[PDB]
Amino acid sequence: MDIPRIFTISESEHRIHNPFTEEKYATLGRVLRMKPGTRILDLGSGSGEMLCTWARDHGITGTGIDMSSLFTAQAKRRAEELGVSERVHFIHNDAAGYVANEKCDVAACVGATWIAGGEELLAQSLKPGGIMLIGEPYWRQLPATEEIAQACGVSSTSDFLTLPGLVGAFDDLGYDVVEMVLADQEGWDRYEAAKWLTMRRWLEANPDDDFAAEVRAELNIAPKRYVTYARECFGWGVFALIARLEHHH
Amino acid sequence: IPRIFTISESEHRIHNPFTEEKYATLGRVLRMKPGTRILDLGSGSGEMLCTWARDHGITGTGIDMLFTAQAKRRAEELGVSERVHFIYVANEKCDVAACVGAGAEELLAQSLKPGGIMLIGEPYWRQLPATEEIAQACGVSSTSDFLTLPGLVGAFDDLGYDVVEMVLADQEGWDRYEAAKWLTMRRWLEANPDDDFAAEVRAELNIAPKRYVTYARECFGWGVFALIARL
Amino acid sequence: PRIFTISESEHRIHNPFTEEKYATLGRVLRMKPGTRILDLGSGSGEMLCTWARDHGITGTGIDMSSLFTAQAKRRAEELGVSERVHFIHNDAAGYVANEKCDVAACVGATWIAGGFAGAEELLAQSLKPGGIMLIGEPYWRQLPATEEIAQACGVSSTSDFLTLPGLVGAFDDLGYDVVEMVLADQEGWDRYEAAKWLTMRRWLEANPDDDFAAEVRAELNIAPKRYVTYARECFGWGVFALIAR
Numbered sequence: 001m002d003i004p005r006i007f008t009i010s011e012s013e014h015r016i017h018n019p020f021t022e023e024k025y026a027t028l029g030r031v032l033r034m035k036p037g038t039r040i041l042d043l044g045s046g047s048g049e050m051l052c053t054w055a056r057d058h059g060i061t062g063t064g065i066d067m068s069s070l071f072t073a074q075a076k077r078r079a080e081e082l083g084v085s086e087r088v089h090f091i092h093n094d095a096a097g098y099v100a101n102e103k104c105d106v107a108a109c110v111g112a113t114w115i116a117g118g119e120e121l122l123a124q125s126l127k128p129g130g131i132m133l134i135g136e137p138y139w140r141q142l143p144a145t146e147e148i149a150q151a152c153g154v155s156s157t158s159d160f161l162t163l164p165g166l167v168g169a170f171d172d173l174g175y176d177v178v179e180m181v182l183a184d185q186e187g188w189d190r191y192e193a194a195k196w197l198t199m200r201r202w203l204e205a206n207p208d209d210d211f212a213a214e215v216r217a218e219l220n221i222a223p224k225r226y227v228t229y230a231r232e233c234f235g236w237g238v239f240a241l242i243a244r245l246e247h248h249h
Numbered sequence: 250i251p252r253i254f255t256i257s258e259s260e261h262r263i264h265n266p267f268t269e270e271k272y273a274t275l276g277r278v279l280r281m282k283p284g285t286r287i288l289d290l291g292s293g294s295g296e297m298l299c300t301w302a303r304d305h306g307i308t309g310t311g312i313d314m315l316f317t318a319q320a321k322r323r324a325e326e327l328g329v330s331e332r333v334h335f336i337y338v339a340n341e342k343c344d345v346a347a348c349v350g351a352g353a354e355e356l357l358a359q360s361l362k363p364g365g366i367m368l369i370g371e372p373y374w375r376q377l378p379a380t381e382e383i384a385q386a387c388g389v390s391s392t393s394d395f396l397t398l399p400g401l402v403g404a405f406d407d408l409g410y411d412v413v414e415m416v417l418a419d420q421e422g423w424d425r426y427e428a429a430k431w432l433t434m435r436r437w438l439e440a441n442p443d444d445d446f447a448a449e450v451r452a453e454l455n456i457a458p459k460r461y462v463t464y465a466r467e468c469f470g471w472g473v474f475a476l477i478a479r480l
Numbered sequence: 481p482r483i484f485t486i487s488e489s490e491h492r493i494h495n496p497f498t499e500e501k502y503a504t505l506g507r508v509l510r511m512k513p514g515t516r517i518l519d520l521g522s523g524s525g526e527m528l529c530t531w532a533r534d535h536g537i538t539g540t541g542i543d544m545s546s547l548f549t550a551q552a553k554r555r556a557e558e559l560g561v562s563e564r565v566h567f568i569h570n571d572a573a574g575y576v577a578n579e580k581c582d583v584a585a586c587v588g589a590t591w592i593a594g595g596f597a598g599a600e601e602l603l604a605q606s607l608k609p610g611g612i613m614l615i616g617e618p619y620w621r622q623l624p625a626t627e628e629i630a631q632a633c634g635v636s637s638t639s640d641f642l643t644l645p646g647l648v649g650a651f652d653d654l655g656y657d658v659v660e661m662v663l664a665d666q667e668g669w670d671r672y673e674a675a676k677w678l679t680m681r682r683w684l685e686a687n688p689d690d691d692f693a694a695e696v697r698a699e700l701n702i703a704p705k706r707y708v709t710y711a712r713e714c715f716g717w718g719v720f721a722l723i724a725r
Contacts, residue, residue, distance in 0.1 A: 031429060129439060164463035177458045178432040180424055189663055194508065197659035200723060204610065223658045228645040242435060278671065280490075280678065364685065399709035412704035413678040419667055477681060 005211060006218050007113075009202055010195040015047070018114035018135065019183030019191050019236045028181050028238060029054040032106065032131065036060060039104040041125055044068075044112055048075025048090055055084040062087065062104075067094040068112065100125040110135030114191075114236050123243070131178070132241045138166045140235030152230045163235060170241055179240030185231065192226050252446060253453050256437050257430035264293045264316070265350055265370065266418035266426050266471040275416040275473055276301045279366060281345070283307065287333075288343040288360050291350045291370070295320020298333040309333040309343075349473055354408060367410065367476040373401045375470030387464040398470060410476035417472030427461045482692055483699055485545065486683055487676035492555075494523040494548075495588045495616060496664035496672050496717040499530075505662045505719050506531040509612065511583070514538065518581040518606055520572035520599075521589020525552030525565060532556070532564035540566040542575050543589075577606035587616030587719055600654055604724070613656070613722040619647045621716030633710040644716060651722055660721030666712060673707045 011017060029050075034040075036059040042051050045064025052075065054060055066072045072090045079085035098121060107122040107130065114137055122132055139162045143149045149157045161169055163182075170177050199219045203212050258264050263272065275297075283306040289298055292311025299320070301307050310333060311320060320335045339360040346357035349370030357367050374397045378384035384392045396404065402412055434454045441447060488494055493502065506527075513536025519528055522541025529552065531537050543549050549569040556562035573592045577584075584603035586592065593599040596617045603613050620643045624630040630638045642650055644663075651658050680700045687693060 027425075031425070031432070033432070163466075164459070167458050167462050171455075171459065176435060176454065178428075178435045178454075180428045180431075180458075180462075182420070182424060184421060185663070186665065189661060190504070190508065193659075193661045196657070196661075197508075197510070197721070200657055200659045219657060220652075223648050223661070224645065224652070227648050231644075240432070274671075278674065278678075398712075399705065402704050402708045406701075406705060411677070411681065411700055412674075413681045415670060415674045415677075415704075417667075417670060475678075 006214060009211075009215060010199045010218065010222075013198045014191070014194055015049075016191070017046070017112065018110065019187040020110075020135075020238070021183075021187050021190060024181060024183065024187060024238075025050050025053065026057070028133075029058050031179055031181065032058075032133075032240060034058050034060055034106065038106060039063075039102070040106040040108065041065075041100060041104045041122070043095060043107075043109040043118075043122065045072075045075065045090065046112070048072070048078050048088070050108070050110075051088045052079050052082055052084065055079065055088045056082045060087065063089040063091065063100075065091055065093045065095065065098060095121065103127040104130070106131045106133060108133035110238060128245055129242060132175075132243070133238055134241065135236070135238045136166065138163050138235045138237070139233060141232050143229070143233050148229050148233070151225065151228070152233050153225070167239075170239065174244050175241040176244050177239055178242050180237065182235070182237035188231065188234065188236075192230070193223075196223055253434075253450060256450060257434055257453065257457075259433045259437065261426070261429060261433075262294060263296055263426070266422040266469075267473075268418075268422045268425055269296075271416060271418065271422060272297055272300055273304065275368075275414075275475075276305055278414055278416060279345075279475060281305055281307060284344075285309075286341065286344040288312070288339050288346045288357075290337055290346070290348045290353070290356060290360075292317070292320055292335055293350050295323055295335055297347075297349060298335075299323040299327050299329060302329040302332045303327050306332070310339075311335045312337055347473075351404060351408065364477065366413070367478075368473050369405075369476060370471070370473040371401060373398050373470040373472075374468060376468050378464065378468050383464050384468070386460060387468055388460070395470075402474070405474060405476055409480055410478050412474055413477050414475035415472060417470070420466065423466065423469060423471075427457075427465070431458055483695060485547065486692065486696055487680050487699070489547065489683070490679050491672075491675055492524060493526050493672075496668040497616075497662075497719075498664075498668045498671060501662055501664060501668060502527055502530055503534070505614075505660075506535055506537075508660055508662065509583070509721060511535050511537055515582040516579070518577050518584045518603070520575060520584075520586040520602065521592050522548075522552060522567065523588065524548045525555055525567050527585075527587060528552070528565045528567075529556045529559050529561060532561045533559045536564065538564045539581070540568060540577075542568055542570050542572045544569075544571060572602075575602070579606075580608040581606055581611065582608055583612040583614060585614030585616075587614055590615065590617050597650070597654065600656075610723060612659075613724075614719050615651070615722060616717070616719045617641075617647065619644055619716045619718070620714055622714045624710075624714050629710060629714070632706070633714055634706060648720070651720060655725045656722040657725050658720050659723055661718060663716065663718035669712060669715070669717070673703070673711075677704055 038060045040062035042064045045051055045066045046068050048064050051062040051064050072092050075090050079088045103125055105127055107126045109118055111117055117136055137160055139160050142162050143157055146156055167177055199215050203215055285307045287309035289311035292313040293316055295311055298309045298311050317335050324330055342362040343360055345366040346361040347368035348357055361367055372395055374395045378392055405412055434450055515537040517537055517539030519541040522528055522543050525541045528539050528541050546569050549567050552567040556565050584607040586599045586603055590596045590599045593602050607613055619641050623643055624638055627637055648658050680696050684696055
């Protein structure tokens, strides 16, 4: 159950695998008002940009658990490049099978793909009244019918939760949402459009590869499928939750 | 003033949808110059004057109250220091009045010079609330409390002024303003749990996030309108 | 008309785009330093000057206005890159570059050819094979329900422009793959329309005796309303990176 060729082929140039932009991650760490030293656990650190960049701006400590590459010296050298490899640590580990030395103040997991979600680990290693950063997808605009949804590339509307229904889901789970950074059309266009050019280059790079057909097909509808439905429907964003905990009374 | 407003915006830098970038854009867009005099009736946080005072070397004086204290900080901290002040009619007729945060036209008028610019921060209906109740949920008495965007520009026109510039707020701007309130409240509930007016702040935070994303996020509109009298 | 020259004499960018939106286009375009560009109706060459400063591209911009061609030449000089770009005063309705260009562009001034399908014939006549073609065209962000409304947005008919999917679907019907897209946002529109309202007023108080004073004053009287009441919701804008299939 690997990753579909198309996805990987049409995202090999992306520096961010979701609608978020540099300005967005930058803002995130800002609104979080984290004091220097705040330890952070980041599952799915990937490039390690978030942790690295925050480490230099808000001056914090942290550790990323990447599950997308054999060696993660691409991020380890990233912290060195920013002169902060003494604060941010990285480990080639895949989610489960992990226990932190000491709890942290911010546990993040934006999720690999913007479509997927992933938390015991996130909660087991988070200090009481800690912030839990989670990137989740939602319906920016609830499609009028399954028809439009199925077109966007989704079984039923019931697959995604609407924004108000998403904040309603966190509350019913005992979670107290205290922050929210949502992506915008611009963020999305950058993410979705960047693919169209990447595929068109791939074709000019491997014309003899019998897969050019699947790319050609994808390209021929990619921009159409996006502007016609997805653009207005698909929504994404990162929520900062803080679980309601009962105390000694 | 519900103290909640003082708590939810306990550490806000801009007590309105506007962002830092928004206040700087209004300034340059107004193509002002060194020697301009303003009167911010409703100064609030005080970011507007301080900011422009720096990147535009402009005089001025804000009025409000006690955020007046908060607005004082920035002045000393920015390097401007007494280029703008904080503490209604002015006996100097500012080169440009303002009321960020109609009807308040009768005031700015009695304190603005002829052919002068008039800034007006006024909220509006970015999108009419599907139904009265929805509008009541957003925290407003009735739909008639605010006017649509075109309705508001039409009001300014029927008052003699022409809109020469206008900087409105965007969703992003709103989230920043609304979300921050949630975090500030939850920080208060953990700093003053065994105090009074907490089981109420606990109520605000219990609904604030739900209320916003559900109704307000796509109805609440705001922005400042620069106006110059005609005739 | 001349109302265009008066209201946009101070503008730096003559469309809903913003400083950031231009930077984005040029960066997402992934251009190697040395790329030759051709802008037809480059207005104040703000697009060629900036990309030449942050990407090392080269190009020339043709525009009917001498005032803009002046601002462009002055702009390239200001950014210290007047060596990479060249601005000439001339017509673009039928311009053709002596040498093919890595990217031919007609952003905004797509009316110089007819609409946008006529702009394809032009650029494509000086664009290296598999070259990138930029097209700045407005679209119905929200297709109106009656010609009245459309007539109240400053246009003649709803057939004047297409919708986002109708527009991209149109570039396709011409055998072009839309590989990149940078759409403008309402904010970008405000900065564009609002500027005119202040320029016209400023020009009005500085030329109360010019022949077009009557007209200008008339434009101002309804421009703010004409926009916020209609246009700001039905109109969309953007640049589309194209490349022959």
